[PDB]
Symmetry: D2
């Protein structure tokens, strides 16, 4: 398939590069993160990707406790990104990196990126760290409501990307570093953060918000029925502040991408849960090979009409292209 849109495609700046064992692989990953116009573009051309919505790597800004430096790095990353997109505006779009450890500053940088730089959304690597940085700051908290109101005003999607939990909140993985990251930890962290947003009633207050989750929903689709329907015989209203069910907000305010989850069975389950209209193609480059994502998607077992929507038209619609 040609003319695809991919939106979990990362890059890095020298300042955040270290955020991502010794050898040829680490060397290649660094080159990939810093490259935009050469290797990346050539692969896009060879693998039917017309539009790539770029985002800074992780955890990047979310792991910078000093709000002052966080704002500085965010602005720096966004300016570099703007410069890179300007070189091939027909191929590259961008997500804003935000210094959410400072709500007001984050709201202001998002406005700058959207109104001044033409960015089409924001991508945040989970909870923020601030001050001593020992407390994970989730976005369902009161201090972030103004920010969400502005996100809804600008009407641009918010991509809730993964990050690892803090060491003190990772005991379950002690002795198992291989379970952290993309293997599992990433999904758990992001799925719950997403659930917190839903449970908080955020989408009752701002129903037009568009949240995006990669890796096919971080496991949410398969368990969505249980999330709401467990112990169904208990006919008492849910205790959380949100007015409706998790499935309602997930179906109405979320979109999921195929980033790093090239599995047909998983895609079928998702199509039968959230629907093809809310699934978007993405690769997770440079952490995943573009050819791997594209070859799989070009041949996955779905209707051709859905391959067109998932690979291109859903995104073009979502980002008003």
């Amino acid at each position: 398939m040609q003319g695809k849109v991919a939106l979990e495609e990362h890059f890095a700046i020298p300042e955040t590069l270290q955020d991502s064992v010794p050898g040829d692989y680490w060397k290649e990953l660094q080159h990939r993160l810093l490259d935009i116009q050469d290797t990346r573009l050539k692969l896009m051309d060879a693998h039917g990707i017309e539009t790539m919505i770029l985002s800074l790597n992780a955890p990047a800004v979310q792991a910078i406790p000093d709000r002052r430096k966080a704002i500085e790095i965010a602005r720096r990353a966004n300016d570099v990104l703007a410069e890179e997109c300007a070189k091939r505006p027909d191929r590259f779009l961008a997500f804003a990196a935000l210094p959410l450890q400072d709500p007001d500053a984050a709201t202001e940088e998002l406005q700058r990126c959207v109104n001044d730089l033409g960015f089409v959304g924001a991508l945040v690597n989970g909870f923020s760290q601030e001050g001593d940085g020992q407390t994970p700051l989730y976005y369902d908290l009161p201090q972030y409501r103004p920010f969400w109101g502005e996100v809804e005003k600008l009407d641009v999607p918010f991509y809730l990307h993964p990050r690892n939990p803090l060491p003190q909140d990772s005991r379950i993985y002690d002795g198992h570093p291989w379970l952290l990251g993309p293997t599992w930890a990433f999904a758990q962290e992001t799925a719950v953060h997403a659930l917190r947003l839903m449970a908080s009633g955020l989408f009752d207050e701002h129903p037009r918000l568009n949240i995006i989750l990669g890796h096919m929903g971080e496991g949410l689709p398969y368990m969505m029925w249980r999330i709401d329907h467990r112990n169904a015989w208990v006919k008492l209203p849910p205790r959380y502040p949100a007015k409706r069910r998790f499935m309602d907000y997930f179906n109405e305010n979320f979109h999921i991408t195929t980033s790093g989850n090239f599995r047909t069975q998983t895609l079928i389950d998702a199509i039968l849960e959230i629907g093809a209209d809310r699934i978007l193609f993405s690769t997770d480059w440079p952490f995943e090979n573009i050819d791997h994502a594209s070859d799989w998607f070009n041949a996955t077992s779905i209707a051709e009409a859905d391959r067109v929507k998932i690979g291109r038209t859903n995104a073009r619609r979502l980002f008003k292209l």
Copy 2:
């Protein structure tokens, strides 16, 4: 469908009853359900095509008793009670053992006692154990539990790894959201990861004949299993965990999942295309779930009639050697 086998069916004894809402008329009903075995439960089984019910103590129960002596005491009592209840109707009730795993040796002894002397057909443990001050979750992939697993394999009976909530110090991500703890989500995360720890530790290389059972359709594992092994596939460097093979291998070869508290056809279809119908078992999670809810859904779920028979009955019959 008639003649079904259900195996995540709970009961409680006065000592563990409190572990199991609000002041609402629901708490009263739940209590009655947990304490009942021969009456209400049996009538529902007769009304909903369930011939065999493999009973297990509630949660967290024994896993939440930090004092070894006490844990060993409560477990033995819960197992003696269970043994007595099953003896009243051996043609309908089977049993899973409650184990005081905060004491590896005592747990091994009690499992042997239950299996060899009481005829229990397996064990059901509610996640990690608490011991001493009870501030450290004790996972079963740890070295001290290897002798135990060797005995489990020797006795050749399944181990049902059931959920429990993580300790508060390990649940900050849920702070302010108590509604996310329990069956809503926390149970799955806790159990899925414990299962992965067992896999990564190489436990199944050492004891390949082990049979582990997970409820709630695998605690989310099937949907993400491909990613668990294949994420960042371009990096051809070998994984550094002790296990010799991949997660999917151990999941496909040493695990079975049940339909407990997850009556969703889409989820069942995904599981069928991931682990296979031969590895899926009907279960309800009674009394936390209504038996009629579980049965009505399963009787009509969109699968092959041949698979409805296997998932609803024959897979469990074979697994627990009920035909011979």
Copy 3:
């Protein structure tokens, strides 16, 4: 779900009533007749009780397609269409109409479609397969040359054409000899209709009129499941197909066809169709009065698909297709 649109919903006029006599046992004949003749009363109460806002009505089968005499066919067609317009006018907020066409006379059929659409406001046409004319011994399929002008007018008026089933003529039914239970909805209807659809595709009709919209009931008359094979059988033979059409069957099916759930309330079938043609091209329908409205609605309300798709298949796809 409320506000659904159903479009394979039949009625009959005295002149065509007997055509449905041989499709149900004698004990059910009186009831089927009542249903076929009723539009304003019981039918509407069933619609209200089962969340159906719009019902696009059509004459029963084979009706006009089984009238060998051109003059008579044109007469009955106009009559049925006039009656249908009368009934819709009684409840214009709930009923829409498909035209009955005397296709044994191409020109007359073209004229009648124009009258129905431009003058009566009908939203499409429903034809029960091939037509009989003259001695009525030869099935007349619509891929034939003489029907090209008609198709050009269908595309110009831009209204869908519902290719409905009918049984094959006796001389073309020997495979069912001794098995009358295989004729009709059991199987013969699907074969007859699926092949007729393939004939239209293979003839290149959609190359000439790419904007045509064809609708098939009973989930595509079996087409989705075998569509890959229809084009890809013997793929090693790298030569172009021998038929007139310039492209593949899958292209025309994917681009010019829509299928409904009439008389095929099977979740597995719906899932296969979703993964072959997509939810955007599947429409809810019941096949009342040959199928119970509650059977269709109850199944569709609970089938295992995304809620977003239940809304599309149940309502918005049809509203989009018929420009409502």
Copy 4:
């Protein structure tokens, strides 16, 4: 996947070679002929390169079923079976065989089946639909009374019966008039075979002989997708069906049939079948030489199913069905 078993794999003898002539263009005819006559070379090399350990061979179509003279049919069947036995004996660790039967003569077909199974070690029979006999103008379906003795023997011998396709006779093909491209594997084959199978079910054959194992290729010739409708159409009519069989079509399909992936390398189709008849009754097959072995194998090795089912469908279901363990 290695060690696969494939069971809709054809070959031909000079006497039946021309039967496959019209099914392929002119330039590809030479290649197809080579493939049909080859068993020990090209075929074996493809099996070794594409993980196929066992190939259950069968004569091409329509072959014997299109020979109206009983005597000639009996001769051709026997000749074809002897050649096949000869070929299998060259590499018995890789090749097994399906008997060709002269069903235009019930008693003769019964005797030949016995000969192939008892004396030649054949593991079943493959018949290309209805038979033609005498004037050959009447399709003879196997649900007819004269074939009951035959079926009784099939059940006694306890070997599967592969109901393979064939095109209907011209007078029974008017729906395809003007569309020769709709005959054969494109569609006519499936319609013809699906209905023949339904006739067997409706006749009550499986009530009388419940241990029969019937096999259909091309993923059930379309049956799985419409199976619910076949039994449940017009469900509001609460009156039993009119056919002589005691139960439902779905019951006989679920209990007496097995389907193969021959010439239908489609994942969506396989998923539907898995949810209708179950993975335990789906078997890998290619339809070589009409389909490329690599096409079938590459698709099956990667299709979206549980690895445990890939093993069953690709090998163990067949080994179990043909008692190879």
